[PDB]
mmCIF file of N, CA and C in Angstrom:
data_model
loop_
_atom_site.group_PDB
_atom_site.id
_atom_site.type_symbol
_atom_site.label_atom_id
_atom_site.label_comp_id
_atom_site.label_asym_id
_atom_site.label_seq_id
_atom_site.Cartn_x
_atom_site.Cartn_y
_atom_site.Cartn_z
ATOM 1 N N UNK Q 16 73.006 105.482 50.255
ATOM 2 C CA UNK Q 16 74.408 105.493 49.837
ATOM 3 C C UNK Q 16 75.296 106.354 50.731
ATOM 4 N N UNK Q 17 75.855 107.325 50.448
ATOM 5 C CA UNK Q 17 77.142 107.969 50.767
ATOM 6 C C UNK Q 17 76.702 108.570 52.322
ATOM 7 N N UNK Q 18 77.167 108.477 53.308
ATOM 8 C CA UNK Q 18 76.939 108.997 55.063
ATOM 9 C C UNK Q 18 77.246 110.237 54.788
ATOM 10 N N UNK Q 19 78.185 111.129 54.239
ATOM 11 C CA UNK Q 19 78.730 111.837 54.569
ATOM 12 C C UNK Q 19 79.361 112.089 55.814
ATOM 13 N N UNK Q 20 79.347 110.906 56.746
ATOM 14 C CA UNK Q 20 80.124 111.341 57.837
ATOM 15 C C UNK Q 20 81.540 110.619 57.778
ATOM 16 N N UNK Q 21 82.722 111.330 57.646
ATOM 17 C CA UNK Q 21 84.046 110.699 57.495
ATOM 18 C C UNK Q 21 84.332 110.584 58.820
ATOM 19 N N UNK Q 22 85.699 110.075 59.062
ATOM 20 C CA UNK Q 22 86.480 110.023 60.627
ATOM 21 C C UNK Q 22 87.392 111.195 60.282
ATOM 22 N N UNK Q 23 87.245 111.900 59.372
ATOM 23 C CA UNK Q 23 88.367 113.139 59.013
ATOM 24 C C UNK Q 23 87.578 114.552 59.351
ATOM 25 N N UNK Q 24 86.569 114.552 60.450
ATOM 26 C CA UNK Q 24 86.692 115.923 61.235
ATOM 27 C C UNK Q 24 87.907 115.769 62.420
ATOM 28 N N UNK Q 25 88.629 114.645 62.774
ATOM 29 C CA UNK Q 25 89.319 114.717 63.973
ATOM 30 C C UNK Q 25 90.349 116.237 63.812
ATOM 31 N N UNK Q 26 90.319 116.614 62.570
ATOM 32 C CA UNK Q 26 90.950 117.788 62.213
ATOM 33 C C UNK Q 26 90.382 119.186 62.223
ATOM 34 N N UNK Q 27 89.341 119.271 61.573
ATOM 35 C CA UNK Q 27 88.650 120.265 61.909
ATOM 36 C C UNK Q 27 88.047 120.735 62.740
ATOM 37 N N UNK Q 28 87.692 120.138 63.937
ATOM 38 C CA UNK Q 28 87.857 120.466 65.375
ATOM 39 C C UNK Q 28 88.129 121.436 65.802
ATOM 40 N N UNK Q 29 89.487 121.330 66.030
ATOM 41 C CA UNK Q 29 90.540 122.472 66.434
ATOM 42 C C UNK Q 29 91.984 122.351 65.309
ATOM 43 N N UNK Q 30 92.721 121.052 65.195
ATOM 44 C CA UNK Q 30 93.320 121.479 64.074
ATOM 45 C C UNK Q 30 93.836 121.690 63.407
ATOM 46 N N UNK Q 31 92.522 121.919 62.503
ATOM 47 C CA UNK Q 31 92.460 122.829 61.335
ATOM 48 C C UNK Q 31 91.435 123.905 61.126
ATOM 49 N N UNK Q 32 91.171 124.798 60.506
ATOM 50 C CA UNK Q 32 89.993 126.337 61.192
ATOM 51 C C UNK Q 32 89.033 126.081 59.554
ATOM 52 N N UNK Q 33 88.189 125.994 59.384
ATOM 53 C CA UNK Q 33 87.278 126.264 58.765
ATOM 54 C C UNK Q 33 87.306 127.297 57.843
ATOM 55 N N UNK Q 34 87.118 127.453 56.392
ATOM 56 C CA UNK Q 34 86.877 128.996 55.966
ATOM 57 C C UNK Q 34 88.300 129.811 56.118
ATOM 58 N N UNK Q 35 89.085 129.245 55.354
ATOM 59 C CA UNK Q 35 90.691 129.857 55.432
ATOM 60 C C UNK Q 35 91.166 130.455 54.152
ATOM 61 N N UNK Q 36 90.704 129.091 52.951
ATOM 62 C CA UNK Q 36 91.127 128.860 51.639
ATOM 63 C C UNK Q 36 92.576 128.835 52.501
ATOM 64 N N UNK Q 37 93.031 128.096 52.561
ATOM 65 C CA UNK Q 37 94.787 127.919 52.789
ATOM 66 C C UNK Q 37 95.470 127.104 51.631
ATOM 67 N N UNK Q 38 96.700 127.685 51.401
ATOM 68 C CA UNK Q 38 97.643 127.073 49.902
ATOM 69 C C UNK Q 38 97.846 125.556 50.396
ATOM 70 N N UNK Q 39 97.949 125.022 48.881
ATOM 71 C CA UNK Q 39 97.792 123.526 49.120
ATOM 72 C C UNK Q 39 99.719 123.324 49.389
ATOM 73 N N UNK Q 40 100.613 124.179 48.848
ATOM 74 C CA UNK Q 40 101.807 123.344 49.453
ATOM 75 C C UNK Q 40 102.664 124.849 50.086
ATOM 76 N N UNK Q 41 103.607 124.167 51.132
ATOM 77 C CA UNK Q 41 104.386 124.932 51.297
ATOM 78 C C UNK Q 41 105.143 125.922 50.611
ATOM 79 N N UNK Q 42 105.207 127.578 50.491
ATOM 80 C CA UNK Q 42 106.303 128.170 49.945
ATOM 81 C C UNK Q 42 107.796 127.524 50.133
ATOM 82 N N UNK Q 43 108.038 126.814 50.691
ATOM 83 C CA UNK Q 43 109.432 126.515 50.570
ATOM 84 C C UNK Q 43 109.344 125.708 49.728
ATOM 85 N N UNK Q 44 108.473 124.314 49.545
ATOM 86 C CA UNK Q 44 108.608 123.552 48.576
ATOM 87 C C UNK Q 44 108.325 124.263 46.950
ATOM 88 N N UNK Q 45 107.514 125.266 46.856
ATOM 89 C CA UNK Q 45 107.488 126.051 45.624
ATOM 90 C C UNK Q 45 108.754 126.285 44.980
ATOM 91 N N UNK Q 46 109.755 126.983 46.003
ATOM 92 C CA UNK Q 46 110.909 127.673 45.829
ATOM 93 C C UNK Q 46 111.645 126.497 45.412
ATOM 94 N N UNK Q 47 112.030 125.321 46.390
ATOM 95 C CA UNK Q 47 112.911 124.141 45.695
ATOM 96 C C UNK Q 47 112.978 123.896 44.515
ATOM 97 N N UNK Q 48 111.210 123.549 44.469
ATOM 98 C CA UNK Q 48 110.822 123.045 43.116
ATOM 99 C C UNK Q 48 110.950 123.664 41.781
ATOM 100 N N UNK Q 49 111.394 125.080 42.256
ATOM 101 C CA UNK Q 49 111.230 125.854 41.281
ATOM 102 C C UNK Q 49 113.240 125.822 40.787
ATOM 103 N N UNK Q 50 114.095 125.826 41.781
ATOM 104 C CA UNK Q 50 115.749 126.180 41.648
ATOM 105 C C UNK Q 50 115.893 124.623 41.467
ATOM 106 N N UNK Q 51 115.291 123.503 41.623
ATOM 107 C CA UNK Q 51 115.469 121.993 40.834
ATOM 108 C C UNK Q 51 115.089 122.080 39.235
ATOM 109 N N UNK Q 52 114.881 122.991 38.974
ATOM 110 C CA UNK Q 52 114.406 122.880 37.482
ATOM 111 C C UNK Q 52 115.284 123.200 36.737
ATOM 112 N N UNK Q 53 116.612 124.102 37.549
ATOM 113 C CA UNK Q 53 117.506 124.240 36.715
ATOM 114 C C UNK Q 53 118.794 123.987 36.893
ATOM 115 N N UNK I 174 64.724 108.770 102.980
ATOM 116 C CA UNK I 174 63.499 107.734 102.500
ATOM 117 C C UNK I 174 62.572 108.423 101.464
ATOM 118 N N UNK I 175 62.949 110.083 100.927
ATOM 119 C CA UNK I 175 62.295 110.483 99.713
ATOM 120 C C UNK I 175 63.317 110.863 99.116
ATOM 121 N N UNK I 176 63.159 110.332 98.003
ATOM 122 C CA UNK I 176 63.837 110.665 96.928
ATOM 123 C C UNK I 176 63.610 111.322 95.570
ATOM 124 N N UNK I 177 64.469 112.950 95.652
ATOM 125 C CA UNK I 177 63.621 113.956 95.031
ATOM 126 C C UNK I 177 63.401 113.186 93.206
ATOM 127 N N UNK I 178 62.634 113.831 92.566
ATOM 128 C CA UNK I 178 62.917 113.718 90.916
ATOM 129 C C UNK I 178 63.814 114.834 90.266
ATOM 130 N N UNK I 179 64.593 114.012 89.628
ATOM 131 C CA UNK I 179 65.580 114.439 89.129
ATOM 132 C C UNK I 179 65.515 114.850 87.655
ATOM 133 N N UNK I 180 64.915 116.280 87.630
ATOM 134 C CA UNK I 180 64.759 116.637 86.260
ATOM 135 C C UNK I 180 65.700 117.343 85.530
ATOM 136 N N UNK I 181 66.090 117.175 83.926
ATOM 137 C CA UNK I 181 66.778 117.305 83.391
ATOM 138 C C UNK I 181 66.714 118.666 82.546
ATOM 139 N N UNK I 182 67.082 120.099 83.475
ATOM 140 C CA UNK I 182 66.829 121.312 82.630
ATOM 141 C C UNK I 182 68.357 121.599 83.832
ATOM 142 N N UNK I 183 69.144 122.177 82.762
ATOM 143 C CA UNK I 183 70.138 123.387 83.151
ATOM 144 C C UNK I 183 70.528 124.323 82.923
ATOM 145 N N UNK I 184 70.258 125.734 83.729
ATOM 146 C CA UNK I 184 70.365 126.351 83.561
ATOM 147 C C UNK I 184 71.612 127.414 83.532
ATOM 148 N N UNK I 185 71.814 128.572 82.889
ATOM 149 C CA UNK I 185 73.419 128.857 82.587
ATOM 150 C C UNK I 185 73.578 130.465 82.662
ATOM 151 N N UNK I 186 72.915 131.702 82.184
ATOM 152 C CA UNK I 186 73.173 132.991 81.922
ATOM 153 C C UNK I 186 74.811 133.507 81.958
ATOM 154 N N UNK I 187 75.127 133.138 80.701
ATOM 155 C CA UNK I 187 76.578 133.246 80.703
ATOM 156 C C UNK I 187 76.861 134.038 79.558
ATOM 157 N N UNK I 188 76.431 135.551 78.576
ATOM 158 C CA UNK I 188 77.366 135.416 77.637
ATOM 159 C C UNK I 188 78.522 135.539 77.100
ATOM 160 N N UNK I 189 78.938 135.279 76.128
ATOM 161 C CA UNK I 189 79.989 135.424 75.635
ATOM 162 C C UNK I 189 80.457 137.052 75.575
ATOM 163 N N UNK I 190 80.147 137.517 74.099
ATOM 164 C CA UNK I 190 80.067 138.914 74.049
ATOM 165 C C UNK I 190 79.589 138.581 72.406
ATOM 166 N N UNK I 191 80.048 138.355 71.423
ATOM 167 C CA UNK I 191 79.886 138.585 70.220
ATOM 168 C C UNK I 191 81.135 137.927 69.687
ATOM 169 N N UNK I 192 80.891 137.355 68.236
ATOM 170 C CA UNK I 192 81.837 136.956 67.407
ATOM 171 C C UNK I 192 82.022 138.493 66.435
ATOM 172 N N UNK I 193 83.659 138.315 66.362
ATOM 173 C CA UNK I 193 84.242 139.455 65.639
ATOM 174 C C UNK I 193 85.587 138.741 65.220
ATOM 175 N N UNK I 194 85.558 137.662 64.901
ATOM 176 C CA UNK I 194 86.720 137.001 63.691
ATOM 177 C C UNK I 194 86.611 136.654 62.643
ATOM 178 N N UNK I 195 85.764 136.948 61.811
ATOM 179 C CA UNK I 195 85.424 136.964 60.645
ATOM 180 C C UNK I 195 85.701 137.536 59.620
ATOM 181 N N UNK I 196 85.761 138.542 60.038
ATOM 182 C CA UNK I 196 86.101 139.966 59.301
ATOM 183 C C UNK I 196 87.631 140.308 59.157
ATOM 184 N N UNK I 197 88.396 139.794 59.752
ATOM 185 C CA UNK I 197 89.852 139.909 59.392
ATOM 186 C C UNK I 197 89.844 138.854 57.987
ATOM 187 N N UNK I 198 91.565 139.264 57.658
ATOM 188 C CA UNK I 198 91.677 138.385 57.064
ATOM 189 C C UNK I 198 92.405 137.438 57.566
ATOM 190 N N UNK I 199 92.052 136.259 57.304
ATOM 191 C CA UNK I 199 92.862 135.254 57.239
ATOM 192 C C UNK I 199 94.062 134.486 56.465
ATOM 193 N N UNK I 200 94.898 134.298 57.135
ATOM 194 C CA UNK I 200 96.074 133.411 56.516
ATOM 195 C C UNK I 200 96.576 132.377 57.318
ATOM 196 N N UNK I 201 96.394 131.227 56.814
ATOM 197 C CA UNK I 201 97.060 129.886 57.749
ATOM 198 C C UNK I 201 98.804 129.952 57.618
ATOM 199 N N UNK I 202 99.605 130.032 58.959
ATOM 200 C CA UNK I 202 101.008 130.439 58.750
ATOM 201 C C UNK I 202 101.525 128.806 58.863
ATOM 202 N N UNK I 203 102.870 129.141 58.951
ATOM 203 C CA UNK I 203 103.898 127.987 59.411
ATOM 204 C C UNK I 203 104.583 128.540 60.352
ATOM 205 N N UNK I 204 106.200 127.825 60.597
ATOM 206 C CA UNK I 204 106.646 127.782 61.674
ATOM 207 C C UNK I 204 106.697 129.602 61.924
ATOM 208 N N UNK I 205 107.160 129.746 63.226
ATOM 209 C CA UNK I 205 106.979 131.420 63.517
ATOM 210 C C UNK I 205 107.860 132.401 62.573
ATOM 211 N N UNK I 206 107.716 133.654 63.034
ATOM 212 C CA UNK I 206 109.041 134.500 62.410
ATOM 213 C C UNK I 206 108.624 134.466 61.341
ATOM 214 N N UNK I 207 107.271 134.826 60.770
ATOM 215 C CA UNK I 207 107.030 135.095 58.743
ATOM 216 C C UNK I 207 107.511 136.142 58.644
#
């Protein structure tokens, strides 16, 4: 069943870095999202 | 009219020095100027 090999290391390569934990969205979009609420 | 064999070992003595990026911390940025 499953390869585990995707075509989505073309990113992790170079990039993107391995071992970051990096936020899933932009602080700016936080902030919008947050002054659209009211 | 001889033709040597062409064996497949290469050799290199090159090192690096050591990995030492680990130990910071990390943060993935955006555009410059945070």
């Amino acid at each position: 069943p499953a390869p585990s090999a995707n075509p989505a290391k073309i990113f992790i390569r170079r990039f993107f870095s391995a071992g970051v934990a990096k936020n899933v969205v932009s602080y700016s979009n936080v902030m919008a999202a947050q002054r659209a609420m009211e | 009219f001889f033709t040597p064999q062409v064996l497949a070992l290469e050799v290199d003595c090159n090192i690096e020095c050591a990995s030492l990026l680990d130990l910071y911390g990390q943060i993935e940025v955006s555009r410059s100027t945070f």
